[PDB]
Design an enzyme around this catalytic site. Sequence first.
Site, short mmCIF file in Angstrom:
data_model
loop_
_atom_site.label_atom_id
_atom_site.label_comp_id
_atom_site.label_asym_id
_atom_site.label_seq_id
_atom_site.Cartn_x
_atom_site.Cartn_y
_atom_site.Cartn_z
N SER A 26 0.69 -1.29 -0.04
CA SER A 26 -0.24 0.01 -0.07
C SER A 26 1.04 1.42 0.04
CB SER A 26 -1.16 -0.16 1.11
OG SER A 26 -0.44 0.11 2.30
N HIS A 107 11.69 5.56 6.57
CA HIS A 107 11.84 5.46 8.02
C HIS A 107 13.23 5.48 8.00
CE1 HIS A 107 7.79 3.73 8.41
NE2 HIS A 107 7.79 4.58 9.40
N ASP A 190 10.03 7.82 16.71
CA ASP A 190 9.03 7.00 15.92
C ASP A 190 8.95 5.85 16.83
OD1 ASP A 190 7.26 5.83 14.13
OD2 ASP A 190 9.03 5.20 12.69
N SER A 251 -17.37 16.71 30.65
CA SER A 251 -18.33 17.08 31.76
C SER A 251 -17.49 17.72 32.74
CB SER A 251 -19.20 16.19 32.32
OG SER A 251 -18.47 15.03 32.95
#
Length: 326
Positions: A26, A107, A190, A251
């Site tokens: 990918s 990387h 990383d 809240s």
Amino acid sequence: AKIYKDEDISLEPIKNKTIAILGYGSQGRAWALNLRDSGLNVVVGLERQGDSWRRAIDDGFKPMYTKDAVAIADIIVFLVPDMVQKSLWLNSVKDFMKKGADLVFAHGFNIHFKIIEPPKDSDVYMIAPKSPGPIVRRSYEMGGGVPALVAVYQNVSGEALQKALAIAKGIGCARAGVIESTFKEETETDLFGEQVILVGGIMELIKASFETLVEEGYQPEVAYFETVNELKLIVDLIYEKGLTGMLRAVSDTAKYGGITVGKFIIDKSVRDKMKIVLERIRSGEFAREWIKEYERGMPTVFKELSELEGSTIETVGRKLREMMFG
């Protein structure tokens, strides 16, 4: 920091260079197609005529074997999984690449921990997006991008950073923002983020919270509802509007709870252990152990996935996701 946007960056430095994208998973697909759509000259290099090869053909590439691709390349981009790069380097790049071709990573790990030693006469640089390939691709097609780091390990030419920036621009990252870093910094930060918060920390914080409730005798379904489900909303707030904007949205009871208890749970002792983790990245210990574990077939990773899958939190998780989506 040095921050670059599309306006800051020229593509001219990589015009009329042949870019070899090594890999078509990918990430490789995303960069290949974005670069091609940006008008650059892209070749796809692969080791095997298999799935990824056929996909590349379907996308209108004519793939070649790595050895051939790197031989005509001016810019060679490693977009195979990090733990396979050394084998690709040794088998099919080092002794085949066009002399003086740039070497490009997403990387900093393999270069930083000296798993690959590059030639002295090649520019070596990095463009490091932090998004899955499909998002790198879709953002680009929509006229946007995802943010990235850029770094340079070797500047032989004089122009390495500008080439890296041009690649960042070509894949769409400059539409969002490119931050200049170093291979050392990207790699260490990383790895540290993965370990202590993005994967390890959040995971075990979730488990420990859920398990606390379950040990005390509350219904596991409720415990999942009260510890996991709402996390997406919180982290969405943080991502959009920071920690302050998150606290403003919850809240009053939640604000007070969180402000008073957060630092009790995540205290000095956690911070000290974070230093140790960082040390073991910085020293190279982590890298060495991980090499060895990967080269044994990751049996630790696989065992723990299996154990996790059968745990109370996962079986309860599965049931409720089933419900929330008959």
